[PDB]
Amino acid sequence: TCPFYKKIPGTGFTVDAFQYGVVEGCTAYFLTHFHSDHYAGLSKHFTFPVYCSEITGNLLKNKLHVQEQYIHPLPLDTECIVNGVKVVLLDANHCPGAVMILFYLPNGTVILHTGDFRADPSMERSLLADQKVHMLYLDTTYCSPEYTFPSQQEVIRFAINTAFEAVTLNPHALVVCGTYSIGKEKVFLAIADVLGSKVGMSQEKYKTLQCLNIPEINSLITTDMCSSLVHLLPMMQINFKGLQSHLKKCGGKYNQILAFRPTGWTHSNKFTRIADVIPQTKGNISIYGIPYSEHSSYLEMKRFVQWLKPQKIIPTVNVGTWKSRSTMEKYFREWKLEAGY
Ligand code: NI
């Protein structure tokens, strides 16, 4: 059954709750972003109102074939009325089209649901600065102090320098980037840009990118693999077997592959810096795991929450075990006692 952490009290609303069939009493289903664990269950046969960003709406239409009449896109940073309740969508700094949702309850309670987010100090100057938030439904993916990672900017700088050096030393080297969802487009676009290439990909993935309102996107991507020296492949194919295989397919246009696997966290984050990363190498093939995160580090999360000073926190990630639940509740209490709310 639909868990309580997916229901907004005092409304008929649910958030990211598309795989339970009809939810008794739901008059509007919100979708924070187009990632499969969140949209799971949506299809062309859905006949309830879906409220979401413009970009998420383009993906629902073109990739899922949900019918236009059930898609209600809203602009960001704008007070909107939905079934008699004032809401605002904010940028979540996750993947394209990902939002946080502010609900203003008839009784005066204000609720923020983060969806998936990477907290950033820039959020402290959005519409959230303007009033008190009583309840926070929080993306707790990396709610533990071992989770440190570098900035996105540092990680992209590393990837750009690595690629540029490799290809300048060997003009017959191929760069490959893995993907399995939207998100992390900066990795492959930043590399393609320093190499004066467009990025080449399958027709399904090109279609997905054409939904995302990226400016000048026609200048940056293509379905013609052979004209491009940055290829995207399914993340499953980023290993020696899948890469050697792939290399054959270019017909000896290339003699070397340099591949990036943008992971979330991996335990080498607890010992090594970005400047000190190394690849796995078998032959003319090298694979870099780079820690490009679209979720809050523990410190970014803690800062956000200590700024917001909510009355109650409802975790939406890692809620399945008593040990995780208990650990998270300890961190929330530390934060509250340190900051004095
Ligand atoms: Ni996500």
| Pairing status of strand 50-52 against strand 28-30 | parallel
Distance 183 CA to ligand 1 centre (A): 8
Residue 91 tokens read as 């940028």
Q: How far is the CA of 251 from the centre of ligand 1 (A)?
A: 37
- Considering the domain architecture, whether residues 64 and 121 belong to the same structural domain is answered as yes
Rounded to 5°, angle at Cα 184 from 113 and 161: 140
Tell me: do 194 and 334 sit in the same domain: no
| Co-location of 103 and 136 in the same domain | yes
Give the method used. X-ray
* 287 CA from centroid of ligand 1 (Å): 24
Report how far ligand 1's centroid is from the alpha carbon of 140 (Å). 12
> b/e string for 55-72 if b means 16 or more Cβ within 10 A?
bbbbbbbeeeebeeebbe
Ligand 1 center to 52 CA (angstroms): 14
Q: Into how many domains does the chain fold?
A: 2
CATH number at residue 238: 3.40.50.12650
Q: What is the CA angle 303-55-45, rounded to 5?
A: 115
Full strand arrangement of the beta sheet holding 173-179: 221-222, 199-200, 230-234, 173-179, 256-263, 285-291, 280-282
**294 C-alpha vs ligand 1 centroid, how far in Å?**
8
Which value in Å is the resolution of this experimental model? Answer: 1.8
* Nearest-angstrom CA–CA distance, 4 and 65: 29
Q: How far is the CA of 228 from the centre of ligand 1 (A)?
A: 29
Dist. CA 255 → ligand 1 center (Å): 36
Q: Can you tell me the distance from the alpha carbon of 331 to that of 341, in angstroms, rounded to the nearest whole number?
A: 14
Token look-up 């990909």 returns 201
CA of residue 213 to ligand 1 center, whole Å: 19
Query: Do 18 and 29 touch, CB atoms closer than 8 A?
Result: yes
Q: How far is the CA of 295 from the centre of ligand 1 (A)?
A: 8
* Tokens encoding 34: 């187009």
Is 1 in the same domain as 134?
A: yes
Cα of 10 vs its chain's centroid, Å: 29
C-alpha neighbours within 13 Å on the C-beta side of residue 287: 18
Domain that holds residue 189: 148-295
Q: Specify whether 117 is located in the same domain as 140.
A: yes
160 and 277 within one domain? yes
Q: Answer yes or no: do 126 and 7 share one domain.
A: yes
CATH number of the CATH domain containing 91: 3.60.15.10
| Gap from CA of 35 to ligand 1 centroid (Å) | 5
Alpha-carbon gap, residue 70 to 64, rounded angstroms? 13
